[PDB]
């Protein structure tokens, strides 16, 4: 924890380093899950499948 009457953290724009306001106070991090796109490498239909 940092100070009593102001606890909800946020580092730059949207990290929001707190759940909302835990009764136990105190904050660790924010990273539930974060994943990106996909792509497919293909040598060509007429060559293989």
């Amino acid at each position: 924890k940092f100070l009593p009457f102001q606890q909800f953290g946020r580092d730059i724009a949207d990290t929001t380093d707190a759940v909302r306001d835990p009764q136990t106070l105190e904050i660790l991090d924010i990273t539930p899950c974060s994943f990106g796109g996909v792509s497919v490498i293909t040598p060509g239909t007429n060559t293989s499948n």
Binding site: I12, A13, D14, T15, S34, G36, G37
Partner: protein, 50 residues
Amino acid sequence: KFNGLTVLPPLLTDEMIAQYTSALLAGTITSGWTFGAGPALQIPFPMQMA
């Protein structure tokens, strides 16, 4: 923080770019200008500067 955005790595790494630059440097030092116009022909550097 993964806000719907991502960066893709460059196709050539910094090490490979450095290797390309070093190859160009070695070619232009030990072979003058001919290595860019066919096979690399060695030539002593003072004569190249001449």
